[PDB]
PDB file of C-alpha atoms and ligand atoms in Angstrom:
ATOM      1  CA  UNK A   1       0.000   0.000   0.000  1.00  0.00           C
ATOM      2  CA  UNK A   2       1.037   3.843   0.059  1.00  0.00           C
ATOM      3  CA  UNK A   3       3.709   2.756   3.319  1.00  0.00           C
ATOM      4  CA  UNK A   4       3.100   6.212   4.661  1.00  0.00           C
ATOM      5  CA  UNK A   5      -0.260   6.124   5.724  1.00  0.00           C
ATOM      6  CA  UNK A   6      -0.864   2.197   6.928  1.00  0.00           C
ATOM      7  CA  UNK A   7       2.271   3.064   9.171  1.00  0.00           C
ATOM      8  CA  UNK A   8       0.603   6.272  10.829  1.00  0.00           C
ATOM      9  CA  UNK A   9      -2.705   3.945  11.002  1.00  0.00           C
ATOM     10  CA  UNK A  10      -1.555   1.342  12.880  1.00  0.00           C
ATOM     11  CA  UNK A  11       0.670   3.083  15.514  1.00  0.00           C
ATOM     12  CA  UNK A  12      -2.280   5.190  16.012  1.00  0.00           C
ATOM     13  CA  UNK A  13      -4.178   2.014  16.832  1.00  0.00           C
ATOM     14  CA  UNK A  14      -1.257   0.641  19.307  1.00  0.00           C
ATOM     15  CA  UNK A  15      -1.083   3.756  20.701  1.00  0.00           C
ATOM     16  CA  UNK A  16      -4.657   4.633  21.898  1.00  0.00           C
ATOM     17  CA  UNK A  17      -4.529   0.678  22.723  1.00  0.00           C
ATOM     18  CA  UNK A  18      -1.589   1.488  25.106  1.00  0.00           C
ATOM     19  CA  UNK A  19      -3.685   3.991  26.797  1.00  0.00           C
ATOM     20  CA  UNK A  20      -6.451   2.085  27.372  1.00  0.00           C
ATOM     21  CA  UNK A  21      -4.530  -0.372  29.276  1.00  0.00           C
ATOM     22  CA  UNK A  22      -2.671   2.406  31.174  1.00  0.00           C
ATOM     23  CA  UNK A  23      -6.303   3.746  32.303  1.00  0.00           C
ATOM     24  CA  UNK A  24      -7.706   0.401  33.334  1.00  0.00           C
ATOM     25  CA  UNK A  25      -4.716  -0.581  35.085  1.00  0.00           C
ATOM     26  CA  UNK A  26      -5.290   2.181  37.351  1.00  0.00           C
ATOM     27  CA  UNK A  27      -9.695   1.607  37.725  1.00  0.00           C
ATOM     28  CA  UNK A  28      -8.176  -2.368  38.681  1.00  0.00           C
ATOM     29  CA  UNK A  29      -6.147  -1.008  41.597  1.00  0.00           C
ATOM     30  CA  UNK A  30      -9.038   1.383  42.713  1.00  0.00           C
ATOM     31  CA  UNK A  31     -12.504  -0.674  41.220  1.00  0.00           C
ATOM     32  CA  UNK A  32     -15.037   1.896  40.404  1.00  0.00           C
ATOM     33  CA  UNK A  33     -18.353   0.378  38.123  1.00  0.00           C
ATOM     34  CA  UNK A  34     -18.041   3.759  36.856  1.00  0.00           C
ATOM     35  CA  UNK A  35     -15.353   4.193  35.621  1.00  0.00           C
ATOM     36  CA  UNK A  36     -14.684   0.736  34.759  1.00  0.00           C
ATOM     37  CA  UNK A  37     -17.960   0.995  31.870  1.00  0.00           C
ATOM     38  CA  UNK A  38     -16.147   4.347  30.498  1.00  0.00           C
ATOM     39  CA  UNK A  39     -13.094   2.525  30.004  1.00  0.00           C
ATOM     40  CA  UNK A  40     -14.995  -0.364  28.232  1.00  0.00           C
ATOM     41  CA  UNK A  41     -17.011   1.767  25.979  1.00  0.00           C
ATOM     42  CA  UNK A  42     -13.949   3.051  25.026  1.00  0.00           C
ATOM     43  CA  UNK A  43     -11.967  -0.259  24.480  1.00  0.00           C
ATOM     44  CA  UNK A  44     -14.900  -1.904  22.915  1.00  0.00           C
ATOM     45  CA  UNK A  45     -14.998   0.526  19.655  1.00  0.00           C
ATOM     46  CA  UNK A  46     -11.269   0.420  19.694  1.00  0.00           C
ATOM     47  CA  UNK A  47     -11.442  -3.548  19.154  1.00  0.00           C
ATOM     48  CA  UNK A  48     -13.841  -2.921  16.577  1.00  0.00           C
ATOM     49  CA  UNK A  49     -10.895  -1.620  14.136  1.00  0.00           C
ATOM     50  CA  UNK A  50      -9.410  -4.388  11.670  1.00  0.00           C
ATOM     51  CA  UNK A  51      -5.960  -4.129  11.410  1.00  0.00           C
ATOM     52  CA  UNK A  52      -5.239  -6.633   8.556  1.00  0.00           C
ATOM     53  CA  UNK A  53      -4.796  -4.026   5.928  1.00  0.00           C
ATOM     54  CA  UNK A  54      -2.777  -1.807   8.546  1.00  0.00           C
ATOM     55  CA  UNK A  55      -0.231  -4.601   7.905  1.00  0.00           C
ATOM     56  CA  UNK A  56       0.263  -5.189   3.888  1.00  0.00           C
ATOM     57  CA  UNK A  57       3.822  -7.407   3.023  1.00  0.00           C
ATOM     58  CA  UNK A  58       6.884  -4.909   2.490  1.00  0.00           C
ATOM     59  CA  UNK A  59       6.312  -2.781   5.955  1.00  0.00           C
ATOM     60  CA  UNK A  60       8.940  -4.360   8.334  1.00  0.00           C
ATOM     61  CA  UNK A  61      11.761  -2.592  10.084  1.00  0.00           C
ATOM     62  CA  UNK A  62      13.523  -4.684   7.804  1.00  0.00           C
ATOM     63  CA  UNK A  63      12.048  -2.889   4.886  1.00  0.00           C
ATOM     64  CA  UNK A  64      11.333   0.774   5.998  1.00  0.00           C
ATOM     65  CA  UNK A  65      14.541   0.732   8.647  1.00  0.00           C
ATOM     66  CA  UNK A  66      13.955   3.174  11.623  1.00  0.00           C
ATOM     67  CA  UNK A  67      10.012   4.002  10.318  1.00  0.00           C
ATOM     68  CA  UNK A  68       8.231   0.469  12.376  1.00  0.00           C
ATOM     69  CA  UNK A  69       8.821  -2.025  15.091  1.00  0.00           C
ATOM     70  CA  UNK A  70       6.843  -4.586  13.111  1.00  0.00           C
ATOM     71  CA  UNK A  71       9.493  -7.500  12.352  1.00  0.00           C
ATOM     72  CA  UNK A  72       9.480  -9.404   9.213  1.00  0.00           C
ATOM     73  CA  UNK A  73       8.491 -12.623  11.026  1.00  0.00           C
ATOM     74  CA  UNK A  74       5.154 -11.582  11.442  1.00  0.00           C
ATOM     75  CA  UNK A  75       4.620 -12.052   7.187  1.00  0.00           C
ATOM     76  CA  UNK A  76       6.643 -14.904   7.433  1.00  0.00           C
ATOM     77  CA  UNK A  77       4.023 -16.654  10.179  1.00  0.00           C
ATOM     78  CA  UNK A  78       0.838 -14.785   9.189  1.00  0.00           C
ATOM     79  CA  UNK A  79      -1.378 -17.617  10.673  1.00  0.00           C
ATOM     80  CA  UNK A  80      -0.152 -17.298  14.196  1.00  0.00           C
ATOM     81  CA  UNK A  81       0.185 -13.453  13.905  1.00  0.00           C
ATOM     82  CA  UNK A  82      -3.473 -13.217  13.239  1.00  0.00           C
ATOM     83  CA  UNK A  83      -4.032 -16.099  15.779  1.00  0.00           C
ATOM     84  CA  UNK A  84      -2.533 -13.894  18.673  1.00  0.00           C
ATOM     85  CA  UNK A  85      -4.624 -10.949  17.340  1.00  0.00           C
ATOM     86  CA  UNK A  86      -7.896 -12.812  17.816  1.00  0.00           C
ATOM     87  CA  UNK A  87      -6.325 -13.923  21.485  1.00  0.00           C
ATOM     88  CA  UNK A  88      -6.273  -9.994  22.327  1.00  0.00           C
ATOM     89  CA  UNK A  89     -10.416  -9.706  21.113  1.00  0.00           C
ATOM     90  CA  UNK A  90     -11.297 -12.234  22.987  1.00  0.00           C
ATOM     91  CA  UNK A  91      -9.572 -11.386  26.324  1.00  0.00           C
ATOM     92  CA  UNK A  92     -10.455  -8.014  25.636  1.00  0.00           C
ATOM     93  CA  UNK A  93     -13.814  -9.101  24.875  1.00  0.00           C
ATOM     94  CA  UNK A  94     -14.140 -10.473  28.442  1.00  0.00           C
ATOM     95  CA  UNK A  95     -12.413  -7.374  30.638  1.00  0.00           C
ATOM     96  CA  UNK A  96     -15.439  -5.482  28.598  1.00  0.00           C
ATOM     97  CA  UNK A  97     -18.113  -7.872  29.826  1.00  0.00           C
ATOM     98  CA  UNK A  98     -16.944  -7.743  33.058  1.00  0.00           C
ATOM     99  CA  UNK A  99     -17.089  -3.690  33.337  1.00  0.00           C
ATOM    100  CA  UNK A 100     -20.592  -4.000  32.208  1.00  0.00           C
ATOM    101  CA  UNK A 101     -21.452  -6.472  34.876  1.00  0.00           C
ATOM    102  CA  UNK A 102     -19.685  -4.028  37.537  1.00  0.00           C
ATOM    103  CA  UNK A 103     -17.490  -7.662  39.107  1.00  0.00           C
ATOM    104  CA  UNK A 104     -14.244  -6.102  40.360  1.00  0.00           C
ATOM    105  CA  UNK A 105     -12.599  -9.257  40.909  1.00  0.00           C
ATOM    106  CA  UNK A 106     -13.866 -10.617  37.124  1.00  0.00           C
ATOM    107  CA  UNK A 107     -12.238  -7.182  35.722  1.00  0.00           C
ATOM    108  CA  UNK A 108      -9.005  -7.778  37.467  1.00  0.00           C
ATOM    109  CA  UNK A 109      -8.835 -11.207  36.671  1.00  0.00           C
ATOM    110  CA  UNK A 110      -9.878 -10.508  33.028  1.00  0.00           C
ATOM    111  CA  UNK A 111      -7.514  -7.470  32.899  1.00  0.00           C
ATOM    112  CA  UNK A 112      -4.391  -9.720  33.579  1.00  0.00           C
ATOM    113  CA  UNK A 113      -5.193 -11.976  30.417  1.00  0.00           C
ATOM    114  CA  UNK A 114      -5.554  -9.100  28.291  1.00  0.00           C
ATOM    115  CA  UNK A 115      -2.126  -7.903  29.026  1.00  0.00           C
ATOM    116  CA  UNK A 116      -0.550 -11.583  28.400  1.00  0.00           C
ATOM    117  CA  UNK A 117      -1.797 -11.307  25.106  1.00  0.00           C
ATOM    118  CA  UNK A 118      -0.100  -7.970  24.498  1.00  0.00           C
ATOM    119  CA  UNK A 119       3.003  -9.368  25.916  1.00  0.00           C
ATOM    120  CA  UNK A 120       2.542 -12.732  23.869  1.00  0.00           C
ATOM    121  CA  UNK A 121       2.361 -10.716  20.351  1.00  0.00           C
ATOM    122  CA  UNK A 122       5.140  -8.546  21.361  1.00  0.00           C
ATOM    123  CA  UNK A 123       7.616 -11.292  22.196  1.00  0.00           C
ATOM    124  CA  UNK A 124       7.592 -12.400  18.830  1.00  0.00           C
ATOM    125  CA  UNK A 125       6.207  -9.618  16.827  1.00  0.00           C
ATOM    126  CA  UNK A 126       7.432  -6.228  17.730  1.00  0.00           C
ATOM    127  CA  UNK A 127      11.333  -5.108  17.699  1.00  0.00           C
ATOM    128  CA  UNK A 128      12.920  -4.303  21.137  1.00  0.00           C
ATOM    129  CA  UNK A 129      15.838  -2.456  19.702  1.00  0.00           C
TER     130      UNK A 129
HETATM  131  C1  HEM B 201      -2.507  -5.464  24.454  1.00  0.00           C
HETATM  132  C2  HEM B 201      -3.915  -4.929  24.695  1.00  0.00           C
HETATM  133  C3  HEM B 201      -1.619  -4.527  23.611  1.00  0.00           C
HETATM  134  C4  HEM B 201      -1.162  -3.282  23.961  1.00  0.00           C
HETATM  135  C5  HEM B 201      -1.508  -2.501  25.244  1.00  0.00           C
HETATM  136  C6  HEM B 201      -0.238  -2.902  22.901  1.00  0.00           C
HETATM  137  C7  HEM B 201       0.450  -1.720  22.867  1.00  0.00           C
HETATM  138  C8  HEM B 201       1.337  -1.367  21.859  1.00  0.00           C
HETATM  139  C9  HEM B 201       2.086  -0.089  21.832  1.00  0.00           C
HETATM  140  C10 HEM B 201       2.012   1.017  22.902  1.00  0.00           C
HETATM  141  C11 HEM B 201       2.873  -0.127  20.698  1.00  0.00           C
HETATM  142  C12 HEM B 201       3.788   0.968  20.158  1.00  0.00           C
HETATM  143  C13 HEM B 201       2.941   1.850  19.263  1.00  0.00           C
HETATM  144  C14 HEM B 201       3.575   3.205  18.980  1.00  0.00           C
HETATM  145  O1  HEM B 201       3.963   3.454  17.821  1.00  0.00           O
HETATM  146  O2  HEM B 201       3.662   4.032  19.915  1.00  0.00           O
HETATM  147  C15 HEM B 201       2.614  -1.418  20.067  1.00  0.00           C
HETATM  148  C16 HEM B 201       3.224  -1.836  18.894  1.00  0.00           C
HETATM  149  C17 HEM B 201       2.992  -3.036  18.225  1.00  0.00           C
HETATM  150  N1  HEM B 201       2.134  -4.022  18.693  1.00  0.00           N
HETATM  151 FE1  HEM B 201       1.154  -4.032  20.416  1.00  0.00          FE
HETATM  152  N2  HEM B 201      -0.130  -3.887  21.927  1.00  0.00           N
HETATM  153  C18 HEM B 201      -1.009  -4.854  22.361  1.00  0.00           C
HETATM  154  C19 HEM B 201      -1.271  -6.017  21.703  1.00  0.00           C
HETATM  155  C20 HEM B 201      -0.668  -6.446  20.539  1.00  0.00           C
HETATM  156  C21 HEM B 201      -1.060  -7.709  19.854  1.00  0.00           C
HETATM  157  C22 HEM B 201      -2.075  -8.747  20.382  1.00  0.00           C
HETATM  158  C23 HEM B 201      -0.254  -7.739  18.733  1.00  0.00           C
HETATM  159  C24 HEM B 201       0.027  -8.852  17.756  1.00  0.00           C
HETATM  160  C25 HEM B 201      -1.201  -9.717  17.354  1.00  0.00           C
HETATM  161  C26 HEM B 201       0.582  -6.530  18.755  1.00  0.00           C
HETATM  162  C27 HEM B 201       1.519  -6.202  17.758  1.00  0.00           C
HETATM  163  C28 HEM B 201       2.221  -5.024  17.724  1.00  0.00           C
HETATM  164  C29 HEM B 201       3.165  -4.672  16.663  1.00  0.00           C
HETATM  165  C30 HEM B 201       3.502  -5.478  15.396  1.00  0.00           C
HETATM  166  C31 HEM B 201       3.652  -3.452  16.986  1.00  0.00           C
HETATM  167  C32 HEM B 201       4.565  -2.641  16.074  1.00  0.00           C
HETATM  168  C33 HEM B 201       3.752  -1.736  15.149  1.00  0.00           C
HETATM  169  C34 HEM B 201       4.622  -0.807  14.325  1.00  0.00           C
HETATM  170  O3  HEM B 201       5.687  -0.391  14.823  1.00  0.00           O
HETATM  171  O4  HEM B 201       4.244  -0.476  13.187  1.00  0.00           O
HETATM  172  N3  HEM B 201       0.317  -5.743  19.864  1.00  0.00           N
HETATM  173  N4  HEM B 201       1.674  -2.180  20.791  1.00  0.00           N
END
């Protein structure tokens, strides 16, 4: 695709993704119903994005050097790269359901798988240099 704006797209996505975590980390220390359904509205239409197209072959750090942390790997196992995508919906899926029921202890609990599928992606996925 036009590299340019697929790159802006997607670290846009990771980005308001990171602060979504950052905010419910803190409602998960401090439960509030509240607060806990804001975050979820939020989350939920930020799951609704597809990121497929955000990552077209061409667009590692490999091939635009400095520009992405994407690694080449994920083209080279597409399968599994999608797999771990549909991990994050679903565990995201169920901290959401969990706001909505206002059960602290199921958003904690829920919260924690969510961020092992961030961390599961990222291990294989996204450069650490
Ligand atoms: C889990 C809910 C999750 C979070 C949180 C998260 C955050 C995140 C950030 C903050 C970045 C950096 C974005 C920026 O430019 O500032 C980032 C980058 C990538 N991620 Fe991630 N990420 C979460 C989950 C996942 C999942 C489940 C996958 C893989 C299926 C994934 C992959 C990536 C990749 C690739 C990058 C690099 C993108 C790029 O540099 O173009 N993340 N993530």
């Amino acid at each position: 695709a036009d590299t340019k704006e697929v790159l802006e797209a997607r670290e846009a996505y990771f980005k308001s993704l990171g602060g979504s975590m950052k905010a419910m980390t803190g409602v998960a220390k401090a439960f509030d119903a509240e607060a806990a359904k804001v975050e979820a509205a939020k989350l939920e239409k930020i799951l609704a994005t597809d990121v497929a197209p955000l990552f077209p072959a061409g667009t590692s750090s490999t091939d635009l050097p400095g520009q992405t942390e994407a690694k080449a790997a994920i083209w080279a196992n597409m399968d599994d790269f999608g797999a771990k995508g549909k991990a994050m919906h679903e565990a995201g899926g169920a901290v959401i359901a969990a706001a909505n029921a206002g059960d602290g202890a199921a958003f904690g609990a829920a919260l924690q798988k969510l961020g092992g599928t961030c961390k599961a992606c990222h291990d294989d996925y996204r450069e650490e240099d």
